[PDB]
């Protein structure tokens, strides 16, 4: 086990302190420090340092919930990269949260007994939990394209607010499309309306509008 | 599998944030971080971090299209460095996009089953897709030299707009020359017209005009 | 013997100077510079540089007390990794504090005669002493949510004061919950009281209150 | 022999230029760059660069005096880590100051003939000389605890001024205690007076006061 | 082949952006990044990134002209470090500009087939071309030594303006001498006039004046 | 042949630009970058980059003179580490300045044919030439302590002007002492005169005066 640099952690903590939890630069920095698969000890201490007390409590809750969803999917499929073929390799939440025997407080033993699939699952779970808490701590139907705003900025803002909301995953694309059509001030509205082809995806709509947009 | 440094990724993300997607320094930095053959996981997370939501959607589209062209060329030639000799090594798009069995979400298994030819093909495809999206996201025949503008500023603006346009590479120099001759208000027009030597390159025209220009 | 970098020591000293002795980032940095087993000379000079005069006196006291507890456990078990099997390898406090013969002021001789078990015991003792002094140097039942204060600030302040106090670790969550319920002015008190679900964690209470709070 | 980085030396010189010679950050930085045992050449050039001309003269004087005290202790004990067992290894001041044969101006030969005990003795002597000159270049009985000042700051200031003064080493602890008792405004005066135990050490007094102090 | 760091290239580009092309600090930085022999790909991309469009066109022109002079000298001497002994190693401009077979667009193959003499000749040619373009993008006979200016600054400015001008190489030293004698306000004029020795070189004049100058 | 880092060269150039040629930190940095034996190409380009035009001319002159002295000593002793035993290894100035056959402009061939003794002799010659030019490019007996000036400032100024002058090294301390005694306005003059001890060192005089000075 090799610890993360306290210099990088200090820089990330100051980034979270000045920019906040939800800025795209902060999420990019977290993705950067979330590159190599981390042990539960690493992620736990990282969130202890970069997050305040109340966001840290929220993040512990969300991380537990996401890990429980992962363990449900694992008991729903014996071919999980964290699982094994026999029943003796089934992964309990004590092993994921670092609470199992031979792991409590010891990162070396942790790194010894853990699987790489276990590590990547823990890491993805922690990233999703961080996203949830960031969206929770500090409205997509109120988003309009400003008179002077470009279209890529409007699309970025709208997709961000729609994907970071309470909608089901299967309802985001139709909502994004129908918001492109009704928001996005009447020049682009008419540009999308008079589309000789049928656009059935936000990416296709974005490409079409970027091609035929009024250069100004 | 070894992940890319989040420090390099953060620096590249800030480069894309300040300079944009199309600057030659940004493309050089991307080529730098595109040096070793990356696994689909690496490139996917890299584009997730450095690109905004809408450019990321566009890039996913373009990457899929380029990979499909690659797979068409692969079924058109059984000697692809990603293919094998027998039919059992034919490479499906699920294996290229990282969607095949034993690869979904697991970078270690990905690195296990993938071929080096597969990796370099994926990498070249991703680079071409990035170029397409950069050219797509953010008029040379409307550029005139202002009455008060200097000539080097006009030349910079014109060369920028001509090279960052939809012209073929072999048509930029003649267009730049003929735009120097017809734009560039009539004092410099007559200065270029009465050139005892024949100027056959934008650099030579710029040098001549800078030598014989009316100091004012 | 190889000395620690004065650059790392200077950075750690400035960290202690700005963040204080008790911040989790400071303890993480100390754990980082406490990774390899240090000789008494190293830890002594490190604490001389990073700590002020009075905290250094306190730390010398605490380190002596912890080393004495270690030596009592060592005379209570002849199988200490610092001890040997015969009586001639029993470790005296002069050998632990670096005061024994051939060690006073000489780090090379120190590194020569010392055991790895001796080094790790000295290191753990010094870490525990640092924790004690940090807890000692610089009231949770008096914390109320102000009439104009938001709830996340109140939760941050309360969790800080409860975790940085003299309570056992197993008594912090119930106290934080019961302080959320009785402090946190009667609007939020009634909001928590009328919870159709049972909230059994500070994170869950924080999430619920943030969801259903009166936007104002 | 490997030279110290001129970048670190430049940073240390600017630190000495802005903060002064006596600041605790400056002494910490000097301790940092005084980590590995330096050859007389290294310390001499370091003090030549970081110190002005007059402080450098003072430091040469003080270094000579401290080295002479070291050589007196060495002739008073044939078991010095710089000495040897026979009389042929006795260390002369020409060998300590780098003036001996085969060493004058040559750092490689210096590093060849010098002992590690010689190096650490030279280094400790130079550090003590730096402390003396810093205390000399730019009053403990005039120190009072301000009405708003905390007790650890007052203790730090008092111990600093008492240890960096002209008192004998055997008279510092009683003076520090009796200054804690008579300074340290009457609340802490009465707190120390009504001590059911007898406090016979500055560390014990500091611990007691920090325990029973009026939180405010 | 190893690429240059995009961090160094970004710093150099910002240096060129703020200080300009002709500042001595910029030329020093270019000399720094021109230390190891670069392949045509490296220098071409470097000038593409650090220079604007019009200076880049000018630089391509000047680089071609200087490489043509080099190839003329090469056909004038079969002992060029880029040439070989037989006629089959004669170096064509397609091989120098990176246009030869097996080199177009491929830096690895470039580094494979190129000679070290080829690399150093290309590098020196590119440096001279950069100097020409910098002197061209933004008068010696108008330079006077100011009443308060020192003599070394005046000599630096004069030698810079004379060597970066349109004079033949064999006419710079006499002009520099005769400008030292007639400029360089009458105190130094009389100091040079009453020289018991005959000064026949700018360096000798500078040395003499620096020796006998009026300290003030 | 491996080139020096342009980053180190840029840092050294900025050091020379801010601190000057004669500062002890600058000479230390030059000694640092003069550690490994450099080829004539390396030293020539280094001095071209870090020095201005006129100091570079002066340095070329001084380097030639010092190399000529070296070659005179070499013809005065056939056992020079640059020479050989037979007459066919005698080293000409064309081989030292890098002007010999197979070396002009080619650092690789240079490194091939040159001897290590040749390299170290060239390096020492270049260092001595740099020292000469630095002493030449930029009065102690006119220094008085101003009526309002402190004594440490006067001592700094005097020691600076005496050590940076044309006196032999063995004549600086007596001159500094006798200038302390006769300058340093009559209050300090009488303070030094009535010294019950004999002060035989500038540091001792400075310490005595700082102790017994009239606080004002």
Numbering used by the authors:
A (entry chain E), B (entry chain F), C (entry chain D), D (entry chain C), E (entry chain A), F (entry chain B): 11 to 148, 152 to 229
Paste lines from the article.
As the virus buds from the cell, the viral protease cleaves Gag into several fragments, including the capsid protein (CA) that then assembles into the mature capsid shell (core), rendering the virus particle infectious. The CA portion of all retroviral Gag proteins folds into two separate domains, the N-terminal domain (CANTD) and C-terminal domain (CACTD). In mature lattices, CANTD interactions form only intra-hexamer and intra-pentamer interfaces, while CACTD interactions are also involved in formation of inter-hexamer and inter-pentamer interfaces. Our results show that, like lentiviruses, RSV is sensitive to IP6 in vitro and in cells, where in the mature CA lattice IP6 binds in a pore formed in the center of the CANTD hexamer.
Further analysis of the different hexamers forming the mature CA lattice in polyhedral CLPs revealed that despite the deformability of the CA hexamer, local symmetries exist in the lattice. Aside from the C2-symmetric hexamers that are also observed in regular tubes (and are surrounded by only hexamers, Fig. 3b group V), a fraction of hexamers in the polyhedrons were surrounded by either two or three pentamers in a symmetrical manner and hence followed C2 symmetry and C3 symmetry, respectively. In contrast, the structures of the other two-symmetric hexamers highlight the structurally dominant influence of the pentamer, where it actively defines the conformation of its adjacent hexamers. Specifically, the two CA monomers facing a pentamer adopt an arrangement similar to those two CA monomers in the pentamer, causing an increased spatial separation between the CANTD’s of the hexamer. This observation was further confirmed via the structure determination of a small set of T = 3 icosahedral particles solved by single-particle cryo-EM. In T = 3 icosahedrons each hexamer is surrounded by three pentamers, which causes the described threefold-symmetric distortion of the CA hexamer. The similarity of the C3 hexamer from the T = 3 icosahedra (formed by CA) to the C3 hexamer from the polyhedrons (formed by CASPNC and IP6) suggests that the structural deviation from C6 symmetry is not due to the presence of either the IP6 molecule, nor the absence of the β-hairpin, nor the SPNC region.
